[PDB]
Design a protein around this ligand. Structure first.
Ligand SMILES: Nc1ncnc2c1ncn2[C@@H]1O[C@H](COP(=O)(O)OP(=O)(O)NP(=O)(O)O)[C@@H](O)[C@H]1O
Ligand SMILES: Nc1ncnc2c1ncn2[C@@H]1O[C@H](COP(=O)(O)OP(=O)(O)NP(=O)(O)O)[C@@H](O)[C@H]1O
Ligand SMILES: O=C(C[C@H]1NCCC[C@@H]1O)Cn1cnc2cc(Br)c(Cl)cc2c1=O
Ligand SMILES: O=C(C[C@H]1NCCC[C@@H]1O)Cn1cnc2cc(Br)c(Cl)cc2c1=O
Ligand SMILES: [Mg+2]
Ligand SMILES: [Mg+2]
Ligand SMILES: [Zn+2]
Ligand SMILES: [Zn+2]
Lengths: 482, 484
């Protein structure tokens, strides 16, 4: 590993994603070959979330990657990738590679709702979407093609919609903290940062101390009746028949997760995978095989290592051994340290003589010896222990970069000191622009958190800036972002 | 269903796939909205095959949907979709939507095999691909975007490659016979119909009698060293430091599976889904209505039906009840019969009094009464019974359309009356072209495959090719017929 995380972050990240065997750079700018290592992490995330939402009643479909011009046109216009040509023959009308599927799914929804009896609609797509991002692309954070799931739901009454938005958001937050061991702040986005066609938007924000910047981890919007008016998704009331518009929601999460994991956990020696998503959770690395190693002893070692690995598998542990005779044990140590496998097993001849083995943690590198009887009990403890110690390590990190203040001056102080700031705010868009302006790379709104620091005292509290709406409507989290 | 399968096949196919709620037609020609129902079918096939191939050891990755012009340019040119514009701004280089990934994965392979020690590389991706086909598209058989799985593999020795080719081909055929209940002919593709960049091509062909045509259900190719040579996928031989090229396969299967399912099994009342991929295997339909609704009895009926479906799901059976108030039991009957649910459950107040229910089969409409204790046993047996009755009927159909001959004249007779033929063949492509011509959306006859189960030795003492003008090698038997 060539670069360090603290000095020269972009090339630390590059080094990690390549020497960790998750990326291969690709000759269409801003898209990246996904290797087995990364893709398994995405599979773990995808599988948990789909089990969750299929338990809830969301069904799965798939709309085509292509969107007609006419479909799309009824403004992110500069972000649309256009097929214009089939080979050498130029196309009558161009077709667009999808960025999202509202334009295609909501007309379908108008067609599928023939009566009140057809509601609710709860569909989800696991697909890939292409946005010709103008902002600097980063290998997992912002790729021009990315894989995600997008769910679009239609409801009779607004209660169902509000409840599902929050349900999905709790799911998203659990993906972050329970799968990837990352702390996140749940909140509402301001009127400036909400999804334009929506009503309100929930988010799950995370903070990179390295970058000093925060990043949106997923979104769950409540669309209200905005789109159902746009696309005329209506039904007649069963009693007192009158044209009623349905209530909608949409939500999404992407491979950005992997990037956020990297940024939060990887150290200066490679990746550090959260145990619950790591492809290989335990790797056994046989050692002690000197020059004078009688081939019977090398076979005996290999036999015991394979027996240990499979008794791990039977106890539900993703464990593999590394028995390649072309590499030294120390080489194997480094290799798997870059791949960030949570626990390495060291099984030498002396450990064999004692019916034990030594486990080494990828975070903090602590060694600890374990007898082979307790293998199926200690090892899962250790995996959970690692998860917690990762999450807490990051959570304390977040808590040390969040400062609360009611003054602009020390707001700017904090912002320059590489941390994000909780301050009272009016919410007004003009003022939010003024804050970002006078902070320059300037300070953006992250979300209005669900957990407020204090109740706002209306006779006292004021906004964090000079003109505003004056009266503080709530506390908002602000900071530099991705 | 307005139209019949027998008269007006295309319009029947449209009616079943729409009123069965799997397709939604789409305003970009040759793409089709996959509704929840069909996609559940695809999901089952995918999970089965993925369990299988990752158990064998194939790993999964994901390359971008976009291909550099240069990558791709290093025949099918009119089928490539080109992104040229990002909104307003035209792009530096144009990019192509992937049509397959050899052009892109094999350079990575060349970068990834640094030694003999890195071998074998056995990768799979589940992804979507686009081809602007020059043929009329039909909703699952040939779509302009379609989803698939492509597996690409590289091996030190040719033996490993041959073996995986055949293993994978067996897995494809199992998807067809164990999952979709369709009988399929394993074979080798002729020199004319094999994949051009390959060595040989295996296939699994299936026959739809409605259209009287065969269709390729999947492919497993042996690329040998042709692609390893193009892209210089090499390693240094261990004993002798000398450049050795790897041996490769690639194989793939697409959403066409669902189409052949539809074509082979659905009747003139809608779908008939095979039990092992059916999204709902059993639908429960109560039977008390109108004025006779002492609501206590309606709640008693609903609560016992939820108990039966719950005890069915816990025994791993995909069962849901249909309890909507709006509709009548006869409507729900017709609805789910369009959806091809293998067995419909009818549970009225009388069966309630007798601790029973009656199950009706979607394939025959045959009824059979079942007491509620034995439900946990009788239902899965019925699911197996229904499966094999589907496969067996389809196999009797295939066998009654497979005919064998050595005289060209009766080859043409058999083909003209809508069935497929197995005849002695030389293997030559010019001769195959003459065959296809002399039979005349291809109205001529194609080579389907050289079957693995040959009937009779094609012994050269006297055996000659079935065409009058061929160089009568009589190398083997080939299966011919109109195909998709
Ligand atoms: N290019 C991308 N690569 C990966 N994940 C992305 C990308 N763009 C957006 N996401 C994530 O996808 C979720 C839903 O997308 P969306 O809300 O449409 O993002 P967005 O408005 O474009 N955010 P931004 O990148 O700041 O413009 C967000 O919560 C992001 O975390
Ligand atoms: N447009 C399509 N839609 C769905 N399945 C397809 C399509 N084209 C090919 N297939 C299937 O996908 C598998 C792999 O594709 P491929 O090897 O390219 O077939 P192919 O050479 O294109 N045959 P052809 O349909 O005549 O062009 C084959 O087994 C086909 O049955
Ligand atoms: O895509 C969204 C909002 C939501 N869509 C459903 C899944 C979750 C997601 O947050 C916002 N957005 C973002 N980027 C876009 C890029 C283009 Br190009 C287009 Cl046309 C449209 C959009 C667009 O609407
Ligand atoms: O796609 C293939 C061969 C194999 N690729 C890997 C998955 C299994 C599959 O049988 C054949 N084929 C078919 N159609 C194509 C269309 C275009 Br456009 C291109 Cl460039 C290339 C191709 C092309 O190579
Ligand atoms: Mg964006
Ligand atoms: Mg083709
Ligand atoms: Zn203000
Ligand atoms: Zn011949």
């Amino acid at each position: 590993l060539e670069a360090t995380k603290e000095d020269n972050l972009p090339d630390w990240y590059s080094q990690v994603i390549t020497k960790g065997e998750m990326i291969e750079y690709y000759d269409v700018s801003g898209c990246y070959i996904l290797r087995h290592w990364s893709f398994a992490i995405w599979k773990a995330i995808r599988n948990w979330f789909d089990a969750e939402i299929t338990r809830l009643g969301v069904k799965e479909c798939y709309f085509p990657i292509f969107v007609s011009r006419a479909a799309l046109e009824r403004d992110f216009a500069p972000e649309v990738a256009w097929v214009t040509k089939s080979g050498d023959s130029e196309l009558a009308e161009p077709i667009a590679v999808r960025p999202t599927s509202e334009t295609v799914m909501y007309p379908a929804y108008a067609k599928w709702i023939q009566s009140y009896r057809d509601l609710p609609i709860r569909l989800n797509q696991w697909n890939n979407v292409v946005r010709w991002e103008f902002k600097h692309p980063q290998p997992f954070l912002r790729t021009r093609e990315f894989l995600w799931q997008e769910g679009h739901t239609a409801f009779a009454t607004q209660k169902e919609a509000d409840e599902e938005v929050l349900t999905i958001l709790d799911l998203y937050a659990k993906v972050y903290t329970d799968l990837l061991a990352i702390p996140v702040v749940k909140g509402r986005k301001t009127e400036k940062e909400k999804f334009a066609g929506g009503d309100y938007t929930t988010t799950v924000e995370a903070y990179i101390s390295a970058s000093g910047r925060a990043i949106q981890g997923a979104t769950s919007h409540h669309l209200g009746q905005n789109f159902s008016r746009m696309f005329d998704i209506v039904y007649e009331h069963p009693e007192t028949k009158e044209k009623e518009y349905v209530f909608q929601n949409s939500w999404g999460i992407t491979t950005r997760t992997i990037g956020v994991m990297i940024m939060v956990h990887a150290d200066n020696q490679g990746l550090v995978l959260p145990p619950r998503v790591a492809c290989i959770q335990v790797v056994i690395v046989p050692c002690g095989i000197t020059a004078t190693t009688t081939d019977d002893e090398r076979r005996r070692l290999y036999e015991s290592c394979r027996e240990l690995e499979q008794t791990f598998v039977k106890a539900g542990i993703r464990c593999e051994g590394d028995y390649r005779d072309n590499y030294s044990p120390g080489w194997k140590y480094n290799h798997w340290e870059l791949k960030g496998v949570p626990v390495r097993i060291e099984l030498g001849f002396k450990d064999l003589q004692n019916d034990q083995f030594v486990a080494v943690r990828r975070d903090n590198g602590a060694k600890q010896t374990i007898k082979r009887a307790q293998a199926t009990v200690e090892m899962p403890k250790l995996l959970e222990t690692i998860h917690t110690s990762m999450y807490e390590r990051a959570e304390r990190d977040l808590q040390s970069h969040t400062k609360l203040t009611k003054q602009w001056a020390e707001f700017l102080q904090f912002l320059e000191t590489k941390n994000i700031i909780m301050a009272p705010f009016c919410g007004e868009i003009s003022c939010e622009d003024r804050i970002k302006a006078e902070s320059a790379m300037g300070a953006k709104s992250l979300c209005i958190p669900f957990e407020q620091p204090a109740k706002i005292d209306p006779k006292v509290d004021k906004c964090v800036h000079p003109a505003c709406g004056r009266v503080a409507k709530f506390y908002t989290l602000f900071g530099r972002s991705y």
